[PDB]
Amino acid sequence: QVQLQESGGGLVQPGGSLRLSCAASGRTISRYAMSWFRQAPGKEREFVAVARRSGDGAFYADSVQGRFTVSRDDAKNTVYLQMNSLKPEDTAVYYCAIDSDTFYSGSYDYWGQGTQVTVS
Amino acid sequence: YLRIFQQPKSAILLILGFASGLPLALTSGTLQAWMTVENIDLKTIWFFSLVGQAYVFKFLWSPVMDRYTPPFLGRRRGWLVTTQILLLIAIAAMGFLEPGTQLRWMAALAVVIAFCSASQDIVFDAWKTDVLPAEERGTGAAISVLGYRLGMLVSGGLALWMADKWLGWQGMYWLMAALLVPCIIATLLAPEPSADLADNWETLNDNLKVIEKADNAAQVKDALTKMRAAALDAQKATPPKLEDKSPDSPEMKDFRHGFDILVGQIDDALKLANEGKVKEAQAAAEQLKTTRNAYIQKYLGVPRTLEQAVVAPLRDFFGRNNAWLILLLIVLYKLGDAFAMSLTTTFLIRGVGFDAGEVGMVNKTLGWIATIIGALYGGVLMQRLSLFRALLIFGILQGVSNAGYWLLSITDKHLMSMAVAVFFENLCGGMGTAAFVALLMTLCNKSFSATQFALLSALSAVGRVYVGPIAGWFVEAHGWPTFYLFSVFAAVPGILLLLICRKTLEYTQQTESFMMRRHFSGAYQFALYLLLLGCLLLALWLIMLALNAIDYTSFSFLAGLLEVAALIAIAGVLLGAILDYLALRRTEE
Amino acid sequence: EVQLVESGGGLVQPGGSLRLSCAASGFNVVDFSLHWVRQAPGKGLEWVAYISSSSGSTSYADSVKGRFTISADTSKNTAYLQMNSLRAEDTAVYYCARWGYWPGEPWWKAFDYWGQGTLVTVSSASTKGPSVFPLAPSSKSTSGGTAALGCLVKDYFPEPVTVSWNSGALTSGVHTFPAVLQSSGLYSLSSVVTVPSSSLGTQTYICNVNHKPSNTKVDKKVEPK
Amino acid sequence: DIQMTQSPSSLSASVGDRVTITCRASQSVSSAVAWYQQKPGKAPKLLIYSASSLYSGVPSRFSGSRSGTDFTLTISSLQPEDFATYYCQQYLYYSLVTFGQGTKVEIKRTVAAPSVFIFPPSDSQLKSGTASVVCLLNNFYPREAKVQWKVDNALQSGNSQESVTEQDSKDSTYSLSSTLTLSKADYEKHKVYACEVTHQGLSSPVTKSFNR
Ligand SMILES: CC(=O)N[C@H]1[C@H](O[C@H]2[C@H](O[C@H](C)C(=O)O)[C@@H](NC(C)=O)[C@@H]3OC[C@H]2O3)O[C@H](CO)[C@@H](O)[C@@H]1O
């Protein structure tokens, strides 16, 4: 009853901006957590950002302030990962993870295919 | 300059200006439109046309507003909430009212709306005067004027578009009520600087009086708590005659020490009340009565409800040095703008020979946008530059805009030249409007800002009211270009009086206080008596006007009475103004 | 240069009624009215009582009136809060704050100085033999990597107890585990530290337990006997 | 102790973000409202007295303002050490000195992965008849994390007690310790006592296992 939609990725001009959309139909992004994850081909799945209940709070990784920002659209029920001042090495697969529990423990069990951000 | 608008205070000022402006057009202009589509004269009812006088004579309603502090919110905020509630109820009632039966009490309800709207204006002007800091006064006046104009626009110019379409008059009025609702909510969100040493001392005395019943002790503790809070609040306030001595002067040191001793006696009384004690509390309460009969009278140990509730604002305003100079400055500062806007429409129709529809559209759009932009620009210049210099620049620009009108009259007709010239005139009008509202807010003593601001607003409007005929006689006698040249030369005296009272204006700007004239020996009281006689003659002439309107008896001498009253009033005003200039000169040397 | 240290421990009967002494240092007790503020564990502050030693004035909260009695000894510069008929919710940390004279800025500086507070509680705590136990770095656990060393105690009447490894010279990787909830009023803490085990045959394992009230030092060292 | 109902009951603001905490007095208390900052385990510190006033040489980061009976404490440039519980205390009437409600929030920060460690019970703790396994989640943000115990591929519940640390002065850490307290007899019935923790900052749950 819940379907996740993804967009974005592909070849990207370095140093500019991007926006990755991760929508969900049937499950409200509010009251749940929607998160993104960097993954270089040779590195692990580092954290990017997460969106909490409505506009109560938004949290980002240490190396993400200014570079990224999660914009929330209530009409679309989705999470946008805005890109800014990308480094030439930010060519990394971006995956989508959802908190299955409203307690915000951090349970990411619903698999997301993940858009392929490639920089340079 | 986006920072001030980002601040919520600009938003509350805008929304309250909208709240004040909304009932004005609905009370009369939209009502004229509704009666016109009904083809009703809306005359001979004799309940109507009180709606016009309601705004003019709001200074009579003001003393109850500055005197009384509603239990909810504060004095300013509580009166505002009350007035908006009555307006919303009245507009909703008129919307509910069904013309199917008869006209019934449409005119009476319109007069009720006008009274409540003049009331809301009074309270909004007072709240805006107190809440706004001195440097923020100009920009806040600008935002209030912008919201006011927007309210007049929606209630007067969106009304026809909304009524002609499916919405209708009933839904139009209820939607005005709905648009009044967030004004009420934002008034609740509005800040409140209740301040008021007189109000805090009155709370002190009210609770002391409810404490003279100190044998029950089911009320002494709470009332003493209220007394202590009021005394702590009034200690940091400034008393009259000592406002200019703000930075820890010896006089204010004695004031603070008196309130120190007072709050110490409330300490002892509350110590005895917390024990639950009857006998010890009563003995030390008799000792407290002795000490209040010996010590605490020093600063305003008086009740608050007095005829003074209505006399004290006038008494203070007239007691200030350069009071009559400021009176005349308020009357004739916007004299040039009144002259121009009195006959702009007829001049564009006939003098420059435009089509009526062209004039209507160009005025409605360009004049409104230019007044708004001039208001904003004047306000930003006000936060940049002092009050007196900004008023000087804006008055000079008002005069040169009337000179632009003279340019228009001499010059051959062109839509673009008229557009740019009228835009310049309304630009300077908006800047002068913002600076003038800032001056009005500057003059109010805030202790009673409602009554003094209403007096000054009526002062400004009395010029406008008398402007119309003199402009008509001038254009019929000498023509339009000569009329506009005289309009510039009559906008000059406002600038001249500003230059005369620049010392007082700069003093008030820097110290936030006014000198009270010490030069009065015999002549000031004489001029005050002349003014009082003029006001009494005006009231008697109003009684005669009512008698003539009811047509039971009519006496033709009322016109001569009006002229004589005006002569005596202006004689007193000029006498006081000359005395005021002399007092300023004496203070200078 | 002033402080309000609050104490009062001693040989008293449990489940009775105790007075909390608030010693005032650096300022006379009569120059400042002392107010006992109660902070129940898990909720906010609540003014409980006050004494004005200058005039003898005294006041209490509604929930403590008739059961408490706050006094002040100007000779030894200390206040007291004799709490009687203690009840389940009477447990809290009692900060004896000070509050200046009126008139002046001392009054406006309400509670400008507090005290560390005393955790008044109702329980069945007693005194019993302690048992210092060192977490041995077993070879089976986390083989080939970093071992999980530590030391722990069981019970004590005086709450202050400090466990340190290598005399506690490190701040990162060592985590004094706050005492688990033992319903008997006693506290069992299990101090732990995650350090590499590259010095198994050379570094000696010593746990240092420090008891301030008794000035007692306990050493748990792995040495031949 | 009853005020107007507000949707946000606590406060959580980023570092360097100006945030305001407000409380309205029941009646007029004049400018006699003080603001205190109480770090956990420590006495409150008087930040603002007279609801706006402070002396010379005092910290200037904290500011206060009053309008009528409404009092607001604002922090201009929020700092990591600012995170504490803030009480508004009107100090007019002695017998009814009232305070605030409370604010229990960790140091707002960027998301930090939990450094998950496991501490097997002491071999000399077993002699007491009990054996408690500790799973420490050192220096992670946000506070919302969970610790399970997949003991031999069997999640254990109930006996696991958690304790999120507050702002301490010895280590200045923000960690979550979970203690799977079982008897010694229970502790001998299983081999591997692994704790699995899930956090928003972890792509996969972190499992720390040890052998008995
Ligand atoms: C001065 C102010 O802040 N408000 C006044 C407003 O004046 C208006 C005045 O212009 C109008 C069109 C006029 O000429 O009578 C201007 N007041 C001046 C210039 O003092 C300003 O523009 C809109 C509003 O404030 O009048 C209202 C009652 O009608 C009331 O709110 C009040 O009298």
JSON list of C-alpha atoms and ligand atoms in Angstrom, two decimals, chain B residues 20-21 24 55-56 58 117-118 120-122 124-125 128 141 144-145 148-149 152 334 429 432-434 436-438 440-441 453-454 456-458 460-461 464, ligand 1:
[
{"chain": "B", "resi": 20, "resn": "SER", "atom": "CA", "xyz": [-8.41, 50.35, 11.24]},
{"chain": "B", "resi": 21, "resn": "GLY", "atom": "CA", "xyz": [-8.83, 51.07, 7.53]},
{"chain": "B", "resi": 24, "resn": "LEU", "atom": "CA", "xyz": [-13.97, 53.41, 7.06]},
{"chain": "B", "resi": 55, "resn": "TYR", "atom": "CA", "xyz": [-14.44, 59.91, 12.93]},
{"chain": "B", "resi": 56, "resn": "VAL", "atom": "CA", "xyz": [-14.20, 63.70, 13.24]},
{"chain": "B", "resi": 58, "resn": "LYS", "atom": "CA", "xyz": [-13.49, 60.71, 18.14]},
{"chain": "B", "resi": 117, "resn": "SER", "atom": "CA", "xyz": [-14.39, 52.27, 14.08]},
{"chain": "B", "resi": 118, "resn": "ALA", "atom": "CA", "xyz": [-13.45, 55.73, 15.33]},
{"chain": "B", "resi": 120, "resn": "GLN", "atom": "CA", "xyz": [-10.69, 51.33, 17.10]},
{"chain": "B", "resi": 121, "resn": "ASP", "atom": "CA", "xyz": [-8.76, 54.06, 15.28]},
{"chain": "B", "resi": 122, "resn": "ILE", "atom": "CA", "xyz": [-8.25, 55.87, 18.59]},
{"chain": "B", "resi": 124, "resn": "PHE", "atom": "CA", "xyz": [-4.76, 51.68, 17.36]},
{"chain": "B", "resi": 125, "resn": "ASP", "atom": "CA", "xyz": [-3.23, 55.16, 17.20]},
{"chain": "B", "resi": 128, "resn": "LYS", "atom": "CA", "xyz": [1.07, 52.50, 17.85]},
{"chain": "B", "resi": 141, "resn": "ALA", "atom": "CA", "xyz": [3.70, 55.15, 10.95]},
{"chain": "B", "resi": 144, "resn": "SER", "atom": "CA", "xyz": [0.32, 51.70, 9.56]},
{"chain": "B", "resi": 145, "resn": "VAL", "atom": "CA", "xyz": [-0.52, 54.12, 6.73]},
{"chain": "B", "resi": 148, "resn": "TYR", "atom": "CA", "xyz": [-4.75, 51.72, 6.35]},
{"chain": "B", "resi": 149, "resn": "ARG", "atom": "CA", "xyz": [-4.73, 52.53, 2.63]},
{"chain": "B", "resi": 152, "resn": "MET", "atom": "CA", "xyz": [-9.64, 51.42, 2.35]},
{"chain": "B", "resi": 334, "resn": "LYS", "atom": "CA", "xyz": [-0.64, 69.27, 5.38]},
{"chain": "B", "resi": 429, "resn": "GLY", "atom": "CA", "xyz": [2.10, 63.19, -0.11]},
{"chain": "B", "resi": 432, "resn": "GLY", "atom": "CA", "xyz": [4.68, 63.83, 4.28]},
{"chain": "B", "resi": 433, "resn": "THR", "atom": "CA", "xyz": [1.89, 61.58, 5.56]},
{"chain": "B", "resi": 434, "resn": "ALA", "atom": "CA", "xyz": [4.37, 59.17, 7.13]},
{"chain": "B", "resi": 436, "resn": "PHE", "atom": "CA", "xyz": [3.20, 63.70, 9.92]},
{"chain": "B", "resi": 437, "resn": "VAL", "atom": "CA", "xyz": [1.87, 60.55, 11.58]},
{"chain": "B", "resi": 438, "resn": "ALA", "atom": "CA", "xyz": [5.34, 60.16, 13.09]},
{"chain": "B", "resi": 440, "resn": "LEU", "atom": "CA", "xyz": [1.64, 63.01, 15.85]},
{"chain": "B", "resi": 441, "resn": "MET", "atom": "CA", "xyz": [3.00, 59.93, 17.63]},
{"chain": "B", "resi": 453, "resn": "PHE", "atom": "CA", "xyz": [-3.51, 61.71, 19.30]},
{"chain": "B", "resi": 454, "resn": "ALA", "atom": "CA", "xyz": [-7.24, 62.10, 18.63]},
{"chain": "B", "resi": 456, "resn": "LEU", "atom": "CA", "xyz": [-4.02, 66.10, 16.90]},
{"chain": "B", "resi": 457, "resn": "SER", "atom": "CA", "xyz": [-5.82, 64.05, 14.24]},
{"chain": "B", "resi": 458, "resn": "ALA", "atom": "CA", "xyz": [-8.88, 66.31, 14.52]},
{"chain": "B", "resi": 460, "resn": "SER", "atom": "CA", "xyz": [-5.02, 67.91, 11.07]},
{"chain": "B", "resi": 461, "resn": "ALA", "atom": "CA", "xyz": [-8.50, 67.23, 9.66]},
{"chain": "B", "resi": 464, "resn": "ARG", "atom": "CA", "xyz": [-8.63, 69.71, 5.33]},
{"chain": "E", "resi": 1, "resn": "LIG", "atom": "C1", "xyz": [-3.00, 59.61, 11.87]},
{"chain": "E", "resi": 1, "resn": "LIG", "atom": "C2", "xyz": [-3.28, 58.14, 12.02]},
{"chain": "E", "resi": 1, "resn": "LIG", "atom": "O1", "xyz": [-2.39, 57.34, 12.27]},
{"chain": "E", "resi": 1, "resn": "LIG", "atom": "N1", "xyz": [-4.57, 57.79, 11.84]},
{"chain": "E", "resi": 1, "resn": "LIG", "atom": "C3", "xyz": [-5.61, 58.73, 11.55]},
{"chain": "E", "resi": 1, "resn": "LIG", "atom": "C4", "xyz": [-6.16, 58.59, 10.13]},
{"chain": "E", "resi": 1, "resn": "LIG", "atom": "O2", "xyz": [-5.48, 59.48, 9.34]},
{"chain": "E", "resi": 1, "resn": "LIG", "atom": "C5", "xyz": [-5.40, 59.23, 7.95]},
{"chain": "E", "resi": 1, "resn": "LIG", "atom": "C6", "xyz": [-4.79, 60.47, 7.26]},
{"chain": "E", "resi": 1, "resn": "LIG", "atom": "O3", "xyz": [-5.19, 60.53, 5.93]},
{"chain": "E", "resi": 1, "resn": "LIG", "atom": "C7", "xyz": [-6.59, 60.60, 5.72]},
{"chain": "E", "resi": 1, "resn": "LIG", "atom": "C8", "xyz": [-6.93, 60.10, 4.32]},
{"chain": "E", "resi": 1, "resn": "LIG", "atom": "C9", "xyz": [-7.06, 62.05, 5.91]},
{"chain": "E", "resi": 1, "resn": "LIG", "atom": "O4", "xyz": [-6.57, 62.87, 5.11]},
{"chain": "E", "resi": 1, "resn": "LIG", "atom": "O5", "xyz": [-7.88, 62.28, 6.82]},
{"chain": "E", "resi": 1, "resn": "LIG", "atom": "C10", "xyz": [-3.25, 60.45, 7.40]},
{"chain": "E", "resi": 1, "resn": "LIG", "atom": "N2", "xyz": [-2.94, 61.00, 8.69]},
{"chain": "E", "resi": 1, "resn": "LIG", "atom": "C11", "xyz": [-2.09, 62.03, 8.89]},
{"chain": "E", "resi": 1, "resn": "LIG", "atom": "C12", "xyz": [-1.42, 62.56, 7.65]},
{"chain": "E", "resi": 1, "resn": "LIG", "atom": "O6", "xyz": [-1.86, 62.49, 10.00]},
{"chain": "E", "resi": 1, "resn": "LIG", "atom": "C13", "xyz": [-2.70, 59.02, 7.24]},
{"chain": "E", "resi": 1, "resn": "LIG", "atom": "O7", "xyz": [-3.12, 58.45, 6.03]},
{"chain": "E", "resi": 1, "resn": "LIG", "atom": "C14", "xyz": [-4.23, 57.61, 6.33]},
{"chain": "E", "resi": 1, "resn": "LIG", "atom": "C15", "xyz": [-4.54, 57.97, 7.78]},
{"chain": "E", "resi": 1, "resn": "LIG", "atom": "O8", "xyz": [-3.23, 58.22, 8.26]},
{"chain": "E", "resi": 1, "resn": "LIG", "atom": "O9", "xyz": [-7.54, 58.87, 10.14]},
{"chain": "E", "resi": 1, "resn": "LIG", "atom": "C16", "xyz": [-8.30, 57.85, 10.75]},
{"chain": "E", "resi": 1, "resn": "LIG", "atom": "C17", "xyz": [-9.73, 58.32, 10.89]},
{"chain": "E", "resi": 1, "resn": "LIG", "atom": "O10", "xyz": [-10.25, 58.59, 9.62]},
{"chain": "E", "resi": 1, "resn": "LIG", "atom": "C18", "xyz": [-7.71, 57.46, 12.12]},
{"chain": "E", "resi": 1, "resn": "LIG", "atom": "O11", "xyz": [-7.00, 56.24, 12.05]},
{"chain": "E", "resi": 1, "resn": "LIG", "atom": "C19", "xyz": [-6.74, 58.54, 12.57]},
{"chain": "E", "resi": 1, "resn": "LIG", "atom": "O12", "xyz": [-7.41, 59.75, 12.73]}
]
